[model samples]
Target: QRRIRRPFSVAEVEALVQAVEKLGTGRWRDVKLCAFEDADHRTYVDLKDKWKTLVHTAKISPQQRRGEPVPQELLNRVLNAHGYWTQQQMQQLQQNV
Candidate 1:
């Protein structure tokens, strides 16, 4: 039973968006090491789970946003990274099939 939470600041979310864009989605460990290595409070699955919410935030209306109110530009980048990684994953799956 280990559960503690911290709301990612706008700055941290920005870093995560950049890291996910370069490293893609499936590599959670890599993302963590690259973006959040210094963030001892965060750990595996944390960033990945955050990305899940980020994608949802990007898809929804701006007025619906909560918390620190991440910028639309960052959310746009999240969409691109999400779409790009989704395509890459499907392509890899198809190649295996």
Candidate 2:
């Protein structure tokens, strides 16, 4: 049987951004555990995909976006987290070099 994919609400997106801020990006399983433990339908992969789309959505101009529009405050959080974690990865790579 096919599963129904429910749309994520603004509240859920806010929770996801907060969880990523606390847990860091790239750890989708941890993100799922932290923010989506109650959502049995939300697999780790689902969280990862949702986060990917969220980041892409944040980067594009508001006029280019589709579906439910994300609030600018949440988009700021998404961009901040993406940049912070990316910098951390680069720093770790530099340290190892």
Candidate 3:
């Protein structure tokens, strides 16, 4: 028995977007208290997108680039979904890359 790992892909992003959009329907809130209050589904998903952006923009050592095919669109979506980006940090990553 072996565990398998797959690279993140556009399909996964599409699935996440679909799930996030369901927040407008008001039923998903039944599972948690935050659902009834401010920033619920939208904010939570936005934060996850932001965290992904930070991870994507971070410089990886040669050791980490072995089989990674980091996608630019993924980063773009993250930036757009979060509505803001830390230019200073991203610039540092670019320099390292």
Candidate 3 lDDT over residue span 2-95, tens digit each: 9555354433444444454323222233223322322345565554554454445444232354755656666665555434323334334442
User: What range of 10 consecutive residues in model 3 has the weakest lDDT sum?
Assistant: 22-31
What lDDT, from 0 to 1, does candidate 1 have?
A: 0.53
**Candidate 1: how many backbone clashes?**
0
Candidate 1 lDDT over residue span 1-97, tens digit each: 5954545453566556555564464544444443344345365446645664555565445555465566475456555666677677745555342
Where is model 3 more than 4 Å wrong at Cα?
1-17, 21-70, 84-97
Screening candidate 2 with a backbone cut-off below 3 angstroms (N, C-alpha, C), the clashing residue pairs are none
Alpha-carbon local distance difference test for all models: 0.53, 0.54, 0.42
Which stretch of 10 consecutive residues in model 2 shows the poorest summed lDDT? 29-38
Clashes by residue pair, model 1: none
Please identify model 2 stretches exceeding 4 Å from their true place: 1-23, 35-70, 93-97
The TM-score values for the models, in the order shown, are 0.32, 0.32, 0.22
Number of backbone collisions per candidate: 0, 0, 0
